[PDB]
Amino acid sequence: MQIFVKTLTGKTITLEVEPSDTIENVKAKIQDKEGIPPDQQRLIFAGKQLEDGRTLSDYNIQKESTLHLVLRLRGX
């Protein structure tokens, strides 16, 4: 299924996922598309920070729904 990942600027990325995909898989897919290392990604759904061990189905995330992406700055 298709989901969307958006930054708080509205910048949008589209991923092909399965409901059973883990949040860590989702971050690897984001790294595959945009080059952001997973350690810098924080994913949020409806204001809740998503945990690497959980799956999209664990958060009832539906086809065509949107996750929000914010960035951890390590440099102061």
């Binding site: 080059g35 204001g47 920070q49």
Partner: protein, 316 residues
């Protein structure tokens, strides 16, 4: 007459016209002729249960153009968790809250061939992963864990055409008055405060819209961005955030955006102040210099405290 879709050992669903009084065995016969197999080796799986040859289509609560699984060698249609049905948010074609259907698949092969050992008796049984057990009747699957799912009931739905269950919403069969408008409507949302306060969907929508636009939603680190009972009762934040689908598409996306902004801020982060940006950033807590950094940020380096371009020394 009516149509039943048959998935024959995971094959693509083909339609079978039946009558309300057609027996399951008769249905096994026609599928048998079509697949070239004997009827006595067929098993019909529907809504978590194997259907018996002497039952009729209407007796099995088979709706128009629903789906049965056929494999080789209490019904979820009648479950009441607490008419009093279940409700889902159907994202298309309805784009609204709709009465729903409770179904179940094998948690390992993701096919609707798992028969339940016992039926669910509460929302927790169907909302908590792996809570209920069964046997996947697929030939090569050793799946034993049930994965429940919900479908919109207002039109035929394919096997993977699922919708989120809005388990706080209930048919108002006993005419409970709405806590805010005092009118009787159906369905209603029941808050999980101690009083189980009841609110109609009209007032729930207005409650959500007015609180969202005023930045009065509540951020909770464990639950996300939510609202409590309209009466202010403690320990009543809505936990299944898809209930805010009642906002409608545009305001729901604004709700998700605001919630992510509030999440950043609660984690100690900052929103980039550059016009047209607003990116969420999580710098080190000790760090005054924040750079909105391959294609995600705007490049602005700013002082975390005054939000102007980064500067040495004290602000201003």
């Amino acid at each position: 007459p009516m149509i039943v879709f048959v998935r024959f050992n995971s094959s693509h669903g083909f339609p079978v016209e039946v009558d309300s009084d057609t027996s399951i065995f008769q249905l096994k016969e026609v599928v048998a002729k079509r697949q070239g197999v004997p009827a006595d080796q067929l098993r019909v799986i529907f809504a978590g249960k194997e259907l018996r040859n002497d039952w009729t289509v209407q007796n099995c609560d088979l709706d128009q153009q629903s789906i049965v699984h056929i494999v080789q060698r209490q019904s979820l249609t009648r479950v009441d968790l607490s008419y009093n049905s279940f409700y889902v948010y159907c994202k298309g074609p309805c784009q609204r809250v709709q009465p729903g259907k409770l179904r179940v698949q094998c948690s390992t092969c993701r096919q609707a061939t798992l028969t339940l050992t016992q039926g669910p008796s509460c929302w927790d049984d169907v909302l908590i992963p792996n809570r209920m057990s069964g046997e996947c009747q697929s030939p090569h699957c050793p799946g034993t864990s049930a994965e429940f799912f919900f479908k919109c009931g207002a039109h035929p739905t394919s096997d993977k055409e699922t919708s989120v269950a809005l388990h706080l919403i209930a048919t108002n069969s006993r005419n409970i008055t709405c806590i805010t408008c005092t009118d009787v409507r159906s369905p209603v949302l029941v808050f999980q405060c101690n009083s189980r306060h009841v609110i109609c969907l009209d007032c729930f929508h207005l409650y959500c819209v007015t609180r969202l636009n005023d930045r009065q939603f509540v951020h909770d680190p464990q639950l996300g961005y939510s609202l409590p009972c309209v009466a202010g009762c403690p320990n009543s934040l809505i936990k299944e955030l898809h209930h805010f689908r009642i906002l409608g598409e545009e305001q729901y996306n604004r709700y998700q955006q605001y919630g992510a902004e509030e999440c950043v801020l609660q984690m100690g982060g900052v929103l980039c102040p550059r016009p047209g940006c607003g990116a969420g950033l999580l710098p080190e807590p000790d760090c005054r210099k924040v750079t909105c950094e391959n294609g995600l940020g705007c490049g602005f380096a700013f002082c975390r405290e005054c939000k102007e371009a980064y500067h040495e020394g004290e602000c201003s």
